[PDB]
Design a protein around this ligand. Structure first.
Ligand SMILES: Nc1ncnc2c1ncn2[C@@H]1O[C@H](COP(=O)(O)OP(=O)(O)C(F)(F)CCCC(F)(F)P(=O)(O)O)[C@@H](O)[C@H]1O
Length: 415
């Protein structure tokens, strides 16, 4: 429905592409270039059609500085809002290595008129982190419009390929296409829009929703919209403990939301009424503190020892969840099953990714993972390629599933 890069005239065009180059960096070295690799097909398409690329992206969460202060800063020769930890310079080098062509780095995204003017078809320029400027994500349209005006002057056509930031207005996601008068979806964005439209339409049944994460409160709108569309609901992460506590199980020192015990009981009641089969953990991996240990305690059932906090779903739960996924034709997953950040509490999350990938590879299951650590698990274990779709935006994918429209999608042209 939305116009894609394949429908754009690109020959001789200077193409502004909002990419997702938010890669993890440590001591100045990229520790995972997966996102850069995923951006290649969109860039290759522009180059193949005879255009040039002016790439825009953010890295980390820099403080940012107001545009007004930029003038002073530039006179001193400095870069406005610069922060070594969040510079895109190493990303430019890695991109060049992957594309096997030069990539000119423009150290200030709002002061690149000259380098941009000298660009020829086939060139690739990566502007410095757009979040070095406060107006990039400002709540004021005028703030975003001012920054976007400068960026829009750097090109002819706009391509959006950073779904993870599409759920919020920003100079780069919504300002530019507005000012420019055109905008289309890159290959990653195109796939995101398609798959979520599929899941909210009439996906193949049975459909199971696997929901995890740290809080039930963060997933209530998801449940509000999805309960009437699914057959199974598998709950994991700390979200599960509020439910288990509400039902009457001992949860020890596990993370929970006392303010949501009533909600949990009402939800379980609603699910039964709608005949949705809800499955909560039947065992847990726990420890006496929020730290990694080689041989964490594994419970025999739903009950958690006093003095222990559950940090991942246990072996029996994994078995049950995997078996349930095996009965479905569609599976949507949002939120990790445990503390994925720590190796001994990552098994549950890896297991769901394994079941989903196998389901698709061997039976055609429509598997969609909504970003975050759940997507990371799939990526690290090589299951991402076997999945129907692994989203790059946790927050954005959840909002679509809540039934909300995304500013970054709406702003694009229709085909
Ligand atoms: N047993 C347990 N005890 C305590 N904590 C537990 C737990 N099990 C899981 N957790 C914690 O819950 C967190 C993830 O929950 P979340 O709701 O923020 O994630 P999400 O739905 O993946 C998301 F989509 F919101 C993630 C957003 C991703 C992003 F911001 F990067 P985006 O840019 O892609 O939007 C993790 O930090 C994890 O350690």
């Amino acid at each position: 429905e939305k116009k894609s890069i394949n429908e754009c005239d690109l020959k001789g065009k200077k193409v502004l592409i909002r990419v997702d180059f938010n890669v993890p960096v440590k001591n100045g070295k990229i520790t995972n270039d997966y996102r850069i690799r995923s951006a290649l097909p969109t860039l290759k398409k522009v180059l193949t059609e005879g255009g040039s690329c002016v790439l825009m992206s953010h890295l980390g969460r820099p403080k940012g500085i107001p545009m007004a202060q930029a003038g002073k800063i530039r006179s001193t020769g400095g870069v406005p809002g610069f922060q070594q930890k969040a510079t895109l310079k190493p990303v430019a080098k890695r991109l060049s290595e992957l594309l096997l062509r030069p990539v000119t780095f423009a150290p200030d995204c709002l002061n690149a008129a000259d380098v941009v003017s000298k660009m020829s078809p086939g060139d690739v320029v990566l502007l410095e982190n757009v979040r070095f400027y406060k107006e990039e994500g400002s709540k004021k349209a005028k703030d975003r419009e001012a920054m976007a005006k400068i960026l829009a002057s750097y090109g002819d056509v706009y391509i959006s390929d950073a779904f993870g930031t599409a759920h919020r207005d920003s100079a780069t996601m919504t300002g530019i296409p507005k000012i420019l008068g055109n905008g289309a979806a890159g290959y990653l964005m195109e796939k995101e829009i398609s798959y979520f439209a599929k899941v909210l339409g009439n996906p193949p049944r049975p459909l199971v929703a696997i929901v995890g994460g740290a809080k039930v409160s963060d997933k209530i709108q998801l449940l509000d919209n999805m309960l009437q569309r699914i057959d199974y609901l598998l709950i994991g992460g700390a979200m599960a403990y509020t439910f288990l506590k509400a039902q009457g199980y001992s949860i020890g020192k596990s993370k929970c939301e006392e303010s949501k015990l009533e909600f949990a009981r009402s939800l379980l009641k609603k699910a039964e009424d709608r005949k949705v089969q809800v499955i909560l953990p039947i065992d847990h991996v726990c420890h006496t503190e929020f730290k990694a240990v080689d041989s964490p305690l594994i419970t025999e059932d739903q009950n958690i020892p006093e003095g222990h906090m559950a940090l991942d779903i246990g072996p029996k739960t994994i078995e049950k969840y995997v078996q349930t996924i095996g009965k479905c034709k569609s599976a949507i997953w949002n939120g990790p099953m445990g503390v994925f950040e720590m190796v001994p509490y990552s098994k549950g999350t890896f297991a769901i990714a394994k079941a989903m990938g196998r389901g698709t590879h061997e039976h055609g299951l429509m598997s969609i993972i909504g970003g975050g650590d759940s997507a990371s698990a799939a990526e690290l274990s090589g299951e991402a390629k076997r999945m129907s779709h692994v989203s790059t935006g946790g927050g954005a994918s959840l909002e679509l599933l809540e039934g909300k429209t995304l500013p970054g999608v709406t702003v694009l042209d229709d085909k």
